[PDB]
């Protein structure tokens, strides 16, 4: 029977939020990193993980100039970051909303190894998720993020892990859209190992087809949904160099064969590549003549912050240089999402 | 492992053929009909079904003037129609190829009831089909057609029937593309009964999602594929009249949420509706203010040839006259494909 | 490739534990009541919900004479009951192990309604479950229990809910077997509403087929699992009464068409049945002259502990009468699980 | 809703037929030979493939003595053999019926390579099968046969081929049961290549689980079906040789974890192994102490006729020696079916 999944007011609200997030010239600042994960970046400088250090890093990232206001349409934060404040008497969500961006959140809870598989893993965080998402929404959160890590080996991935991750993302999106939060789905494939482009493209098509079949199964309202797939690049140890245009055509082909046009927008993740390479790769993505009926934007955590963290270096006086270089990189990526980036 | 479904050269060949079939301003003339099925249309006039009568009907539909040349990009015929000849020393495939259109064939073999259902059907003709498609290809047919009839009751279609039909269509498309023939997939939902628009839209989304999941499963090369879905219309007994714009938006919403942009084109059929209603409905389809990354085109057998057959009336002296009314309506369709039809 | 799911010694240990739990001449005592579920049972007497009342009730059930020692092969508890102790300062798991039974835990976390589906719910409790199961294992629990509730209406259950619950059970069993805990699976179909025996039998076959397909998908080691299905009975308000032999043959037919013989044992649940009715029904189950290769046993909650609950009545001087009636019911059920139950 | 797949009377008829075919001590004589298979077997002697030679071969096999009456409960024949007759004015169906056996038929139509797969194949013959099965049933046949070939390699079989074959077999069984014909499902895995026993066991479990899930999907009445799986043996060029008891344990484990007890009986196929080895392997399979609730029986075409074929020598005068050797091996296999064979 025809059973509705969302009342029309919810459809309109989610569509408006998703359009505001992936509006042209905008993007996602993936500043969210777990209290343990960001410790690696903090010690990369030569320092140690500290609560005030993390808060000041996120303050540096989220207190930039007007130059990035029409360039960062969404910022994703952690659970503890949402309950913090900056040196202005305002919390971080208030600053993000004032700057024009949309406050995000990472509602994942890490990965866990599976049984009877080589290196397949599944993510957790679905239990008690409706109340958590309601709490996030009442504190101010219009879109969440859930990621699944999938690795390509000599016989990986199996259909079991792919379907498991698809079901997990379907349930995640269902809960988020019921609570009133735009779900971001990231079937990320690790660009690690030694393989060519065709294998990665084929795996990406399979994963995207399974994910969208699962989404259609769970009565997901695809119009209020954002997609964050990987980029079609070879393995890290691959020696066969591929041109940027080949990467662009392979990626647009992979997205065109599986993703329905009703998806509001398709962001991207760097995947172990330098900032210049990722930015020019997405610029090539936005330079393909094929029909792309969805807004293509960027979402980089490590590609927009490595320069910022090395310039900041743990000192409270190098704030401006790190902010300036981060703004320069953000401007480069904002020009990259329209095909207007030249080196 | 990555296994190539098709070689690149035949990928380009099927892509070119599919682009030529659904080229802008063109169309599909569903001149195909079973030798037994055409008997009903012939006796509707009040005349005796005869082989010469069938051949002359096909001739009349397939010997029109230049006014329909940039309007019929493809004509579908039956098994015997290819082995026929016209009154000028030219077979029907030769006439169609010279006129500009592409010869099509119907490789279905009727339906058969299932077991333990509320009434469901699946089509046959998959076995011993590679050699038949090769024969049709060297006869002069560059694309085929397969249809699946699905009916909406109170709990139909079930998952079993939908998945079985999707598998049948996937095998059909795989065989056709292996032999070098562009497959046309027709998940026909019958507009019969008493139901509203939302139920038909939901069923259409489910069916298209299952069909495209099956196609991705069978390594189908979607770029060389044509889709022929139904129209989102209520049953003939429905007492709630819906405006044309509502039908257009519902249909474009159904097609946008499931069909990837890589599909070369999406045709349509009328079923139980008059010629003017279907033509203005497709005009509304092409006048909807939403982005559609595929060429929308028409394909009507009964909603475009009824006037021609009634004007012919079983008499050989109305040849041109029956053609004229056939031409004019076709021109209307050539105007509906671009949204330029105003009755 | 052929990736192992469990080391051989783990397989042997799980097989031994599962055989011990469901060995002939044993049973399962379902005390899997949290501090909230037991509140309704406690107030049904006319008293108040108290922690000491809960502990004394579970002491009354779990401290009994030898008459029930070869009758209860397993007692299921909740999180707090493991960390409790009797009057003589001995923990409940120690008492259960001394009496000969096997300690079990309920690792569910309630239900949550789904989106866009009528009257369907899915259970939670999978997140962070490996560490919780390890804690339960080193506490003294050797087998867990998971329940998924499914109701029967007009279009229920849908394929979505059935597959979702099957995947949840598969992940549950995978985690439990990886940690070293025998999983008990309860796809419980509510005998509520207005329907006949055939519909319930058909739904039960579908649910069990989906569950075992999911279990085979997740590399589950079926020899170390316990199945706790419903009993094939009509709805609560059915207009036609069925004989006990018909219920027995329907249940054994449903179990024989889906359950592989490698399943260690199949228990049951009351589903709104009195003590005498449930006892004679399971006696009929074991009286059906069909080849059943799995050990059939009982697992009763309210159908076996209601008389003891009312006899205890909240007073501490009625311990012996409630104990005697509970022992009588346990003896009746232990005689019923062999076909030798004399009314 | 609950829609019946078969009426109760024909349910009883199919159950009786299936029980008669797999009755204890009986067996299946695979006397079907394709025009290429029989060509190879007759050229093994060196004689010319002739219609009279084929008819005399089948007459030799199907008319031996009363000593095979309690040993051969079913004979599978080719399409042409059903319309044949012996030299005594009596057709083969009547001879088989009088002798006590049941006449079979092979309703397959060969294999066809798939697209985008290493070495996967799917069988054809489903189109126009209701009428063919009705003709076969009215001719005298009571149970059909369908052989599926699956190969084990580095990544084979894929899930696509497994699901394809499962759906093909489900449709086959549904059609046969609707026409009143007991289907025999043979998910045969080729014992060719180089692999160990565990991989073959794992593949067999996967294939059997998928096949029975498909059968449950298509409303198949499992009580009127027979199963003919591939005996769990390593590859042809396996480096490590395994004991017969290990083979029997692996086979009973594979069949017990997937096959519901409602299956009437499970036969077996030789699979490129010597005749004495096949006989002793089936004896060991019947020597396993594990509880098997289905009747195990033999079905060999090459293993029961190679000695008879070579003794016949393509001569009219060497009839009796070949007949005696064939009846001796029939007696040996009948003894092995009950676990009572000792060389």
Numbering used by the authors:
A (entry chain D), B (entry chain C), C (entry chain B), D (entry chain A): 2 to 344
What sentences appear in the manuscript?
To solve this bottleneck, we developed a cryo-EM support film using 2D crystals of hydrophobin HFBI. The hydrophilic side of the HFBI film adsorbs protein particles via electrostatic interactions and sequesters them from the air-water interface, allowing the formation of sufficiently thin ice for high-quality data collection. By testing six different protein samples, apoferritin (480 kDa), glutamate dehydrogenase (GDH) (334 kDa), catalase (240 kDa), influenza haemagglutinin (HA) trimer (190 kDa), aldolase (150 kDa) and haemoglobin (64 kDa), we show that the HFBI film can protect the specimen away from the air–water interface, solve the conventional severe particle orientation preference problem, improve the quality of the cryo-EM micrograph by forming thin enough ice, and produce high-resolution structures of small proteins with molecular weights as low as 48 kDa. In addition, we found that the HFBI film adsorbs protein particles via electrostatic interactions and that the particle orientation distribution can be regulated by adjusting the pH.
We collected a large cryo-EM dataset of aldolase with the support of the HFBI film and successfully completed single-particle analysis. We could visualize aldolase particles clearly from the raw micrographs and observe the secondary elements directly from the 2D classifications. The cryo-EM map of aldolase was solved to a resolution of 3.28 Å according to the gold standard threshold FSC0.143. A nearly even orientation distribution was observed with the computed cryo-EF value of 0.84. The Rosenthal–Henderson B-factor was calculated as 156.3 Å2, which is twice as large as those in the above studies for apoferritin, catalase and GDH. The increased Rosenthal–Henderson B-factor of the aldolase dataset could be attributed to the background of the HFBI film. In this study, we proved that a standard image processing procedure was sufficient for particles with molecular weights higher than 150 kDa.
